Amino acid sequence: DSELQLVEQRIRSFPDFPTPGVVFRDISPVLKDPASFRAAIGLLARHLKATHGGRIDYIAGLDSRGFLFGPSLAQELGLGCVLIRKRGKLPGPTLWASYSLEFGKAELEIQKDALEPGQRVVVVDDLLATGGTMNAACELLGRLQAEVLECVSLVELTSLKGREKLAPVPFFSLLQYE
Amino acid sequence: DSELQLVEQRIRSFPDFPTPGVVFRDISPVLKDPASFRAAIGLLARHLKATHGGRIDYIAGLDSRGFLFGPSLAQELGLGCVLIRKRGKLPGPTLWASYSLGKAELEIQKDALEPGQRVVVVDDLLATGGTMNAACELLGRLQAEVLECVSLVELTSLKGREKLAPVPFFSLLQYE
Ligand SMILES: O=P(O)(O)OC[C@H]1O[C@H](OP(=O)(O)OP(=O)(O)O)[C@H](O)[C@@H]1O
Ligand SMILES: O=P(O)(O)OC[C@H]1O[C@H](OP(=O)(O)OP(=O)(O)O)[C@H](O)[C@@H]1O
Ligand SMILES: [Mg+2]
Ligand SMILES: [Mg+2]
Known part of the structure; x- marks a missing residue:
């Protein structure tokens, strides 16, 4: 697919970052090339509309x-976007959820009124x-009694088996690397 | 301006966050209401086109x-977006710049822009303008020309606009 090629060709892979042995998939060039960014958003939007029709109420970033x-x-789907943040950044009543990140623990947080049951x-x-971040997001959304239809990303590192961590929540990525 | 009203009416204010005495202006409802978000982007884009014509090469977020x-x-302007990050997140050769927040640092890849x-x-x-000022420092060290800085919200009592001068600044909404 030519649209997909526009995205794939703008991922820049850095070896041994942030640790020896790991390859970092840099999405900066996708952002920097407006045709690449437009293609990425279009491909995600087409997958989501084809899969869920009018069922989606909000995107959570x-x-x-x-x-x-x-x-x-x-915006491409005609929907609003809600935020899930690193803990400590959102005002008002919140819920938070730990997850493992690198060698330690981090927390995500969501405003309690971000979504309605x-x-x-x-x-x-x-x-x-690893799926830790996305899994924490799903936990938070579940605790608001929201229904998570799907999680999506530009890049998926398939040898880390993050998709399995999210099951049974469906997952889709544009691009896959070991 | 009803477009501007679509943005203003989706700012939510929280006293004493993160510290007593201040008021946090929460942009979350602007992002949640697609009409409000579209208005904000449209107002910024229209200002930038009216001020710079076709001279902008990139947005830096x-x-x-x-x-x-x-x-x-x-995207609205037909341009790419470059990233300026909190230090420690970007691969490849970088430059960084400290500012008062204790201390924090922003960072940019050395190849983000050409002179x-x-x-x-x-x-x-x-x-305070500290974050925006650090971004301008970084871009200047790449020999990029910063035409303007923009934001949705400006806290005028903190005099951030003056900190950035002579770089022009524009905000959609102003609060003390
Ligand atoms: O599937 P996981 O193993 O959880 O890793 C994926 C997450 O890691 C990165 O975020 P990071 O915490 O590095 O912060 P950033 O979003 O500020 O770059 C990336 O943006 C994902 O959110
Ligand atoms: O003009 P200043 O006094 O520098 O403050 C403005 C900055 O503060 C907030 O960022 P923050 O560092 O809180 O991080 P965030 O972007 O992760 O919310 C806000 O998003 C601006 O970037
Ligand atoms: Mg992340
Ligand atoms: Mg900030």
Whole structure:
């Protein structure tokens, strides 16, 4: 697919970052090339509409790199975007959830009024690795009694089996790397 | 301006967050109401086109809340968006710049821009101007020309606009 090629050709892979042995998939060039960014958002939007029709109520974007994609994706679908943030950043009543990140623990947080019970959400982030981040997002959304229809990303690192961590919540990525 | 009203009426104010005495201006409802978000992006884009014509090469979005506006504004203008991040997140050779927040640092890849390229920086909120000022420093060290900085919200009592001078600044909404 030519649209997909526009995205794939703008991922830049850095070896041994942030640790020896790991390859970092840099999405910066996708952002920098407006045709590449437009293609990425279009491909995600087409998958979501083809899969869920009118069922999606909101997109949820994940702090921080997921913020690059959430609002544009929401806009393309005619939807609003809600935020899930690293803990400590949101005012008002919140819920939070730990997850393992690198060698330690981090927490995500959501405003308690971000969604109402029964609302249907799709979560977007730039990249799925271990799945810890996306899994925490799903936990939070579940605790608001929201229904997570699907999680999506630009990049998926398939050897880390993040998709399995999210099951039974469906997952879709544009691009896959070991 | 009813477009501007679509944005203003979706700012939510929280006293004493994160510290007693201040009022936090929460942009979350702007992002949640697609009409409000579209209005904000449209007002910013119209201002920038009216001020710079075709001279803007790139938008630079500031980690993290500025990431919510950078790509959409860039797309509206037909431009790419470059990233300025909190230090420690970017691969490859980088430059960084400290500012008072304790201390924090922003960072940019050395190859983010070429000398002479013209940039507009976007963030959600201008307060002291420390974050925006650090971004301008970084872009200047790449020999990029910062045409303007913009935000949705400006806290005027903190005099951030003056901190950035002579770089022009524009905000949609102003609060003390
Ligand atoms: O699937 P996982 O193993 O949880 O990793 C994926 C997450 O890691 C990165 O975020 P990071 O915490 O590095 O922060 P950033 O979004 O600020 O870059 C990335 O943006 C994803 O959110
Ligand atoms: O003008 P200043 O006094 O520098 O304050 C403005 C900055 O503060 C907030 O960012 P914050 O560092 O709180 O991080 P966030 O973007 O992750 O919310 C806001 O998003 C601006 O970037
Ligand atoms: Mg992330
Ligand atoms: Mg910020």
